């Protein structure tokens, strides 16, 4: 194991889609749940896989405050997404913050969070660590329009077979 | 040696985003910084890397639970300092 600078050290963000996981908004939701008592946690990584399905979620409670947490300034959308699913609407009251049922992170622009922030395009995935020098990085690393889909959620009791955001309905 | 009759949770294909140009005012903007890079599953590297990513998320969550930083954790120096301390 050879390390020369800190620049040789790469944190790659891999997606759940690339590991044969169904990332429709109805199948992704059920991997997410709210809870109280655990705080957000963020981490930086250096590059990321171009994801297939990303999410831009803006669901609010019948009061009006947005369920998810207002992102810090350094939170930007996922750079390379092929499809973005705008989930938007009105959902019954729910306390706490939405985390992952798998232990995976919500990948942002070079930031991985344990919770999703309102107004920001994220993908689901994980972080790997690999160490490589320039001679080998030159051979291991060889040197876009998004499709927007729109969904809404309806306020009321969720069914037992449903994501945290409830049943989602695609619209125009 | 490696055959897709073996892998079942890995897509073997992987593309990633990674004169006066170094000056902030003259460099790329925040949506023009990333170059597309292609990574081949030459020695089953792509599926090892998906596997690594999937495996690291227990160490990573545990570590992020250890810490009280509520802004953004920096992992690079962490990895380095433990490299230098392992020897």
């Amino acid at each position, epitope marked *: 194991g050879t390390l020369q600078k800190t620049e040789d050290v790469h944190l790659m963000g891999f997606t759940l889609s690339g590991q044969k996981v169904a990332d429709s908004p109805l199948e992704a939701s059920k991997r997410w749940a709210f809870r109280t008592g655990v705080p957000p946690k963020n981490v930086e990584y250096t590059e990321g896989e171009e*994801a297939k399905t990303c999410y831009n979620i803006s669901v609010t409670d019948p009061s009006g405050k947005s369920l998810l947490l207002d992102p810090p300034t350094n939170i930007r959308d996922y750079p390379k997404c092929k499809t973005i699913h705008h989930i938007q609407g009105q959902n019954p009251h729910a306390q706490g913050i939405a985390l992952h049922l798998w232990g995976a992170f919500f990948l942002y622009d070079r930031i991985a969070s344990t919770t999703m922030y309102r107004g920001k395009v994220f993908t689901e995935g994980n972080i790997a660590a690999m160490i490589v020098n320039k001679t080998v990085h030159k051979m291991i690393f060889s040197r876009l329009t998004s499709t927007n889909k729109y969904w809404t959620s309806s306020n009321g009791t969720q069914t037992n077979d449903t994501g945290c955001f409830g049943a989602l309905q695609e619209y125009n | 040696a490696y055959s897709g*009759e073996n892998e079942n949770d890995c897509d073997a294909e992987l593309r990633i985003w990674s004169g006066l140009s170094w000056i902030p005012f003259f460099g790329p903007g925040i949506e023009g910084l990333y170059t597309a890079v292609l990574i081949k599953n030459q020695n089953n590297l792509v599926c090892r890397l998906r596997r690594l990513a999937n495996q690291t998320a227990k160490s990573l969550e545990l570590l992020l639970r250890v810490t009280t930083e509520e802004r953004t954790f920096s992992l690079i120096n962490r990895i380095a300092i433990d490299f230098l301390l392992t020897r």
Partner: antibody
Amino acid sequence: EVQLVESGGGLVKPGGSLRLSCAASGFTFSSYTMNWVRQAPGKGLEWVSSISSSESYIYYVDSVQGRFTISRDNAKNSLYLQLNSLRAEDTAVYYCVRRDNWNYDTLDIWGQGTMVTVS
Amino acid sequence: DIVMTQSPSSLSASVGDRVIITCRASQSISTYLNWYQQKPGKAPKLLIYAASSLQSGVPSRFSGSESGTDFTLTISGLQPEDFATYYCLQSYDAPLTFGGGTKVDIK
């Protein structure tokens, strides 16, 4: 025995749709990247599309970009190619080809092919 | 798009002859080149891959070598069944591209 079988090709009027199928056998279809290559009468081979196992990398040859749509259903071990706004230059025999992602992404399993005529 | 230039477009040869077919890339594609052999009315068959490796079930008359962007197909001893149209295909980035071909006739 690993085999790919093409069907769903016929005679179509210039300016309408035609849907091709493929049905894998013998190998794990969900683990491999699938391609479509056509050969126009008396011309050479021509790669047209590829879809990756997880369906996350999708590629087309710009002659057909926006016109054709590739997809797959991994449970059915089936590969599909929807051909839209068909042209006089789209007359070609189409194969479904498996790309082996662990032997340097080589196209090794071809089908017998199906003929698509746009007259 | 990566371009592929196969040479010549046609070649005349006899049985037992040595045949040299060349293949040139616009950019550098490493060793991600394959060679095919197609007969009229038949699906193309994979002979060389990784620019030099031999596909199971292919005789050892066919052989591939790489020198930068330049690649070579080589059939040192021709059988009466080795008259067919060959192509090189780059398997590196997409769109994947095939050469023009090479028609090997009887001399």
